[PDB]
DNA sequence: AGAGCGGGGAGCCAGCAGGGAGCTG
RNA sequence: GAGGGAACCCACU
DNA sequence: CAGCTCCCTGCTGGCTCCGAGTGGGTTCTGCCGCTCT
């Protein structure tokens, strides 16, 4: 839904890296190089940014009830 | 059937009354007997 | 082998065998009308028990055009000598006893079918 | 330019992406409903006979052009409004559109002209509209327009909303109609039988089946008889031919036996001729048939009329239902007898019941058409009864009073709501499960349920033949996705590119056949039949043709360019038996295949280039269909094609298998369905594990739909952090799985650690779970309405005070507001009250009927929605939100059938770690792999390690030579890991290296709905049942567990008689009765005054106290109700 | 007058219709 | 401190 | 010795059975019109 605050496996902060990852992707970095530029060296964090589905952008398309 | 055998009526209706009473008693004991209509509710579900 | 049916000519129906002892011969006498007919062949009922050796009349030549049927080049035709042939098996219950290949010539207008 | 093999994977996935860009996944439901609405309803209305009522003046009622509105809601004020689907879901409204018909009433009077009255647009009922079809309000809307309506653009549609409940129509596998099928009856009086489920096309009427059977040997020979419809005995077939108007024998045998040099056919028709010799005239034959009908006749004329109408309108209706059609019906009956003779001689082979060439699929279209046919017949019956009741005495009838609009509306609503398909008054004989509540647990559940087929076969059948995976399911039906248990092999799923034909008119094919040298049956001698190819169109023998090469090539050329032959028309040529069958009817399932001609694909690089820019050429899948490149092939036509699995099969080989390929597969991984296409490397798994994963990917937890906040679903499960898989197939792009994913990529070590993962269990990381790993929410919605039950019983949403309300469960009402409802944000517990409803009874005037929360369910009220239902009452729905943290006993599954429960949770410092400090999220047992043979799990871990190091998303499409274990191993070794995925793990407790090296890697695990807190149950004592006074049913009613008969047998074998008594007497239903010591019947016993009395004996001193189960007392009293005396003698 | 009452398989068993023997006037 | 049945469907081992 | 009686056999119809235990859900009772004021 939204990027997890921490990596599940180790606990590295990955919640501050989703928008940076998207900005690096639209700067035509490859995904491996974008992950390497963010300091995610263990594959447990690379799956955390790599496999993320950001559903909250589509939940914000619905007009707020409250 | 008590009324139609006390307030006297013809045999052609007392026979139907006897047949229907026999059907009701049998379907009280045995509803799943074949060859006869099933005892049914107003919802159409058969009697237990 | 098998002897066919005989048909009446007047009432368009079947004939039936009968033995007239006046000439002591066999006639095909219809029993809807009074039509009679002498018989060329004396065979009335005939049965085949192990005489199922001829599967070739049931095969039609059209099966040469089947894309799913297997083609071979090692069995050339005897009639026209074409290299291509299609090979299959006889698929009846009376051919479960055999796995004999029946071949049909692939070339158009030939239609020759054989075995082995 | 031919597509070179290095570009072929990209090319085939581009054309597959084009197919799934245009058609989509629920296209068959929407197409069937659209063709039902546009064509079938009007056909049913028009084909209904006009109502001709005469007492007298004569009234003719004719029905005309139908009109269907959009789905509208009428409130109690009567003002129409456009009904949106979320309003129907929230307010429990039926998403239906009103159906208006035009009626013409003509009056005929003695010595007076007609009087025509035009009731334009007469309301006759409401048709439930299927979501996202043509006549839905969401049709044609963009994604922004759908999000403004609080709808999900990913939601497929294809379902109905009945009373706020989403209902899907499961397709039903019927036998194919109008086709002669010959089977050898097992242990019957007939050796071979030939049936035809005959039904006239484009007319919804029930199929009339005619059997043409041949008797067993153990008379002279073999007799062919005919089991006609509505003729209750077996008419000999020659008598049927006589009754059709054929006195002669060359007439009958030219209709039956097409080649007269063939002797065996004659030797088998000889007993059938010679048994029916005594009947020689047409009307004599008609008398012989009509004497044994369902309604016999005392008059010969009545029997002649009966047999004439049976052979006119009931015996083979599809070939002809009209007069002068004796020759076409007689040729078809002769064809049936001919096929019977061919199969009995062994020359032809018996038909297969499980072959889907012999089966059609009733989708929403034909099923709703059958319903609407019956219900419109009911409506016309009601109109004729009302109008006849008036014109018996009254002058005239107003028609709008005669139109019972509840017939169509409530009948369609009932059948779509209950699933009992048919009429409510015959619900015991109605087929159930046709309509089902749409599964909304994840998106895979929704798609799988919307693409579901069902064999109408009893699930208690011990025969395996309909359950078998038949060979003809290739590419049409998923081979893996089927239920486990009693419905295995009966409930099925479509493959991805399988499309079910919607139906077409046979006519333009018939004019083309007329003007393409086909000689009609009505204008030929039978002697021309013996070497000509018969032509069947929708099972109707229409003629013969003498050049079948050019006819079949011409027909295929027309179909391949979207001419006269439409794309779904199936055209089979049976070469060996000289037949051409053309099927245009609905229910045929087909799939697109590439066309191979002269060992070359017709799909070339220009098509791929044009499809590469689908947005800016307006090139699509339909242009590929129009280009003669792809072709829709169904099951009977797939028996005559020669498929290439890949274009590599077209290449010349050193051992050439085939050089006459007719079609080629687009990609073989389109034999899988929706739920089996989530499995990475399905071909490396054992097939039971593929079936298990097809089952358990529907129970996984993810985000089931995007607008889950608007919806008040009874049960909803939402994962906190769903991830798309690192190891995906290319079919997962068209299932939208990377937008609504249903699992998390775990770090899984397959290790033996502490013993707590043995026998399918897993060990989870407590520290990972603390960070949100597999955390979820369970939403439960409760509905309650102020129902007005007459004048007295007025239930109202009022906050209950104990001073005025009775019948409470003695729970606090303080969390309720003063409007009688709880408010969002309040923590609730299993005893708390969320809705306060009070009913007014005729001090305690009010009785408390408050809605309580489910037992032991902690939660917080997420939403309260207050509205008016269709009846104008106040209606409320409360959604309660419970956060489910992963817990010991929660069921987690991978994508390979490696289900299990969490056996223990260790913290991060306790779980084993690699040299980088990577601890696994899940540890599974090694022993779960070997007998299971889920090598796809190991390869998924390896490929996920490679994909997480590389940054790619791994491709695991089933049949892909470019991906193999050695390639992935070399790739993993390129990142400084061991090539086979093993790592040196250290013990978390001691720090010491584990001697073995542990296979660890990212694997996609999914959390299943089967949580332990939703299943834990216990009882000491509590609610008992009303009748037998035994404990209740299920944990929802605080019930007890069943100590069934096998438990009794086990406790007998144990010898534990006192434990057997405790379970079966004390812990279930202890009871004491008083029994007369003389007669043994239970006796009256006033225990207050110690007055023990037995009538029937006048006994007052000899009465005994007997302890029994209450069910024993109930049994004995049922027996004494049954005029049986169990005389319980204590001596 | 609205409120309320009425109206599929599988396998075994039992009875009846066909035999073949014996019997008597 | 305890107030419905039945039918059906799905699922679980 | 012909016709009748009296028990073996063949047939068809009737009848009764079809794993154990669990969750969850929806939908139905009940079905509508009356005769009295
Ligand atoms: Zn990490
Ligand atoms: Zn004759
Ligand atoms: Zn030749
Ligand atoms: Zn007594």
Tab-separated table of C-alpha atoms and ligand atoms in Angstrom, chain A residues 6-12 14 42-48, chain D residues 918, ligand 1:
chain	number	residue	atom	x	y	z
A	6	UNK	CA	11.860	-0.512	7.856
A	7	UNK	CA	13.154	-3.530	6.017
A	8	UNK	CA	11.390	-6.586	7.424
A	9	UNK	CA	14.505	-8.741	7.566
A	10	UNK	CA	17.118	-6.425	9.054
A	11	UNK	CA	15.478	-3.143	10.026
A	12	UNK	CA	17.239	-0.719	7.698
A	14	UNK	CA	13.630	2.165	3.669
A	42	UNK	CA	21.732	-6.429	1.128
A	43	UNK	CA	19.172	-8.111	-1.095
A	44	UNK	CA	16.683	-8.027	1.796
A	45	UNK	CA	16.367	-4.249	1.296
A	46	UNK	CA	16.677	-4.475	-2.472
A	47	UNK	CA	13.582	-6.671	-2.506
A	48	UNK	CA	11.914	-4.118	-0.252
D	918	UNK	CA	20.586	-11.437	7.077
H	1	LIG	ZN1	17.175	-5.258	4.864
